[PDB]
Design a protein around this ligand. Structure first.
Ligand SMILES: Cn1c(=O)c(-c2c(Cl)cccc2Cl)cc2cnc(Nc3cccc(CO)c3)nc21
Ligand SMILES: CCCCCCCCCCCCCC(=O)O
Length: 451
């Protein structure tokens, strides 16, 4: 059937022009909104707007539960860490489209197999067994291993619904009615200011709300934050859902991250569940968010684990309050007297109050060390008076217990004295993705410890 789609995720209607759909249901798509992120569809139940990536053409690989599309080798190992023998998925290379691999779990290890393509287009893992389509290849290996360590029996679940950047398919419908928001308890014991957990009645949706109470944050500052957040769109940066700027108290409403900040999460987690592959997954997400800020000409200035928030299934998002606009390559100078979190501050910032995307790279290195140590305080017992002097003499924190060598080298690259000698976030993200190609991070941690 021409133009037929199938729902990949459930979606509940609440914005009156939106439509409720159930995973597996068929839909006909009528058209798209202004940015293609939402589409008007018809089902046997009705007609209305639904998120475009919650559905897929009946004729596309994404309809298969085992096809996870653009997922990296490391992300695949995370997805399969919750599985059993025979759990598997098929993924595609993000950089080089068309290149696919099978990731399969067996006896606690994940095996990765490249899917080869013959001159006539047939696909195979083992040359003796070639197929016309991907689905036929998977079906074959679902019954006999035929070259694989075991059979493909349990597709890795797609546990996370795609991010929706807002709540409406329409153009700028950010303003919302304050009466539809129920404010609850403050979040973070006040470390983030006037931020409260709240419920957005209209959707019984839990949210985070920052309110401009009198004699707190300056108005221009609050509004600039709201303005900046309207432009930020990335899976790993806290997403804006709406604002209330018609009258005081002004509100900034965002998605709610259920587990709190990364620092507390790492300090209180079960290290068996949150193993090295999970830490790598979280660090990679943070680098992706920073690569986005880098390309969009923003600087953060407060990158640290306490400013990264954790959601379900180890999703991590960087808090995006306080961002500043700065053409990537230029320098921002803070007015003398500014007080900074010394342990996460680059040398040029400490000495000259100069900040750039490169000082964020330095902070990312400290954040990486916090991740690798499950939240230890940086520089143990070093006085917060001799840090600059020590750094100037090339002292740097020591490699964390069990930390793989390549991860520590990345930390050291981030801590180069001269900002121009530090890698870009694009380079950092790419480095994580290509870091454990001939053995797992699990294996490397072993070599580090056994030693
Ligand atoms: C602390 N905090 C914020 O400052 C913002 C936010 C806002 Cl409301 C406006 C602009 C920018 C940001 Cl980052 C969003 C936000 C979302 N989720 C959370 N979750 C959270 C934080 C601390 C503890 C707990 C546990 O109850 C859960 N905390 C959040
Ligand atoms: C991207 C983050 C990767 C870093 C992973 C470091 C894992 C360290 C595990 C420490 C081993 C436990 C030792 C005890 O005994």
């Amino acid at each position: 059937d021409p133009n037929l789609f199938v729902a990949l995720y459930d979606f509940v209607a609440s914005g009156d022009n939106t439509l409720s759909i159930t995973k597996g249901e068929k839909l006909r798509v009528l058209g798209y909104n202004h940015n293609g992120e939402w589409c008007e569809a018809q089902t046997k139940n009705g007609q209305g707007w639904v998120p475009s990536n919650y559905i897929t053409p009946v004729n596309s690989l994404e309809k298969h539960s085992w096809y996870h599309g653009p997922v990296s080798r490391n992300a695949a190992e995370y997805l399969l860490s919750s599985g059993i023998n025979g759990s598997f998925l098929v993924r595609e290379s993000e950089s080089s489209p068309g290149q696919r691999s099978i990731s399969l779990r067996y006896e606690g290890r994940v095996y990765h197999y490249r899917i080869n393509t013959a001159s006539d287009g047939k696909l195979y893992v083992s040359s003796e067994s070639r197929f016309n389509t991907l689905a036929e290849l998977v079906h074959h290996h679902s019954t006999v291993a035929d070259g694989l360590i075991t059979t493909l029996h349990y597709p890795a679940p797609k546990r996370n619904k795609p991010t929706v950047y807002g709540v409406s398919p329409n153009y700028d419908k950010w303003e919302m009615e304050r009466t539809d928001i129920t404010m609850k308890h403050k979040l973070g014991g006040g470390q983030y200011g006037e931020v409260y957990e709240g419920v957005w009645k209209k959707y019984s949706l839990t949210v985070a709300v920052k309110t401009l109470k009198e004699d707190t944050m300056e108005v221009e500052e609050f509004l600039k934050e709201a303005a900046v957040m309207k432009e930020i769109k990335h899976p790993n940066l806290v997403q804006l859902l709406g604002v209330c700027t018609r009258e005081p108290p002004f509100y900034i409403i965002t998605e709610f991250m259920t587990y709190g900040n990364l620092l507390d999460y790492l300090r209180e987690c079960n290290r068996q569940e949150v193993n090295a592959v999970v830490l790598l997954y979280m660090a990679t997400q943070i680098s992706s968010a920073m690569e986005y800020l880098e390309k969009k000409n923003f600087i953060h200035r407060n990158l640290a684990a306490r400013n990264c928030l954790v959601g379900e299934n180890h999703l991590v998002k960087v808090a995006d309050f306080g961002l500043s606009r700065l053409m990537t390559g230029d320098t921002y100078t803070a007015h003398a007297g500014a007080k900074f979190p010394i342990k996460w501050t680059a040398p040029e910032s400490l000495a000259y109050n100069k900040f750039s995307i490169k000082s964020d790279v330095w902070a990312f290195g400290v954040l990486l060390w916090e991740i690798a140590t499950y939240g230890m305080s940086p520089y143990p017992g070093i006085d917060l008076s001799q840090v600059y002097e020590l750094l100037e003499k090339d002292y740097r924190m020591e490699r964390p217990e069990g930390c793989p060598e390549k991860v520590y080298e990345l930390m050291r690259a981030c801590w180069q004295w001269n900002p121009s000698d530090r890698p870009s976030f694009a380079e950092i993200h790419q480095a994580f993705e290509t870091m454990f190609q001939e053995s797992s991070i699990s294996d490397e941690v072993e070599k580090e410890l056994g030693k």
